[PDB]
Amino acid sequence: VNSFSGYLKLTDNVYIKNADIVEEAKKVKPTVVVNAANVYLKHGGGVAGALNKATNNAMQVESDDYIATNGPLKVGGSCVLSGHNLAKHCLHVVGPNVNKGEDIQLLKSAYENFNQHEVLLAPLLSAGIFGADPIHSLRVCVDTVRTNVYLAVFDKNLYDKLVSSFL
Ligand SMILES: O=C1CC[C@@H](c2ccccc2)N1Nc1ncnc2[nH]cc(Br)c12
């Protein structure tokens, strides 16, 4: 038993809710919150900008040190950093950005990072301003992640549609 509440169960291991991941994190304080990152860990907008703002920019400060030491992530890759006031850890995961011209097949690789963590609070990767189809992304998530994932979808009409069309 865990502390996540109000989720629709999609499969044995995938759950979904119409909520702001930031508010879910503040309420639950999960072991792992997933950020929808870019390779530079520049948390300017979307989920990343919102999470970073909620940490009072501490996520960005930590991220800049990470990049200065290690260089950029790979598209499809991830790193584990602090969750600051929101979670124990933040798993920064880079899905492909179609608005940048990247290969959507890398979305499966991105979701594979979730399998290194028994339970996660996450957004849909590559959706929103990353330019991919959120229905697709949900399918890849369900078909790739085997650990317990709680998906927060902020856009209300998207949740509705994803709920009702999920095969
Ligand atoms: O609705 C959705 C679906 C796709 C995802 C997204 C991810 C990256 C960039 C744009 C959109 N997204 N957006 C949020 N999902 C959950 N929690 C949130 N908090 C603040 C935001 Br913006 C937000």
User: Where does residue 83 fall: left (phi above 0), alpha (psi -120 to 50 degrees), or beta otherwise?
Assistant: alpha
Which of the listed residues 151, 154, 157 should we mutate to test ligand 1's pocket, taking the one with most ligand atoms within 8 A of CB? 154
Please name the residue whose Cα sits nearest to atom 13 of ligand 1. 154
For the CA of 137, the nearest atom of ligand 1:
4
Q: H helices within 9-167, ranges in order?
A: 21-28, 46-54, 58-70, 106-112, 134-144, 156-165
Domains and CATH numbers, the chain: 8-163 (3.40.220.10)
Please name the residue whose Cα sits nearest to atom 14 of ligand 1. 154
Q: Which two tokens stand for residue 26?
A: 């503040």
How far from 96 is each of 46, 99, 100, 157, 167, CA to CA, in Å?
Answer: 15, 9, 8, 23, 24
Angle between helices 134-144 and 156-165 (to 10 degrees): 50
* CA–CA gap between residue 69 and residue 71 (Å, rounded): 6
Q: Which residues line ligand 1 (CB under 6 A)?
A: 20-22, 36, 46-47, 50, 123-124, 127-130, 134, 152-155, 158
Q: Which two tokens stand for residue 91?
A: 């798993």
DSSP bridge partners of 15: 9, 150
Tell me the backbone φ, ψ of residue 88, rounded to 5 degrees: -60, -55
Q: Which of 1, 19, 9, 14 is nearest to 155 (CA)?
A: 19
For the CA of 152, the nearest atom of ligand 1:
16
For the CA of 155, the nearest atom of ligand 1:
1
Method: X-ray
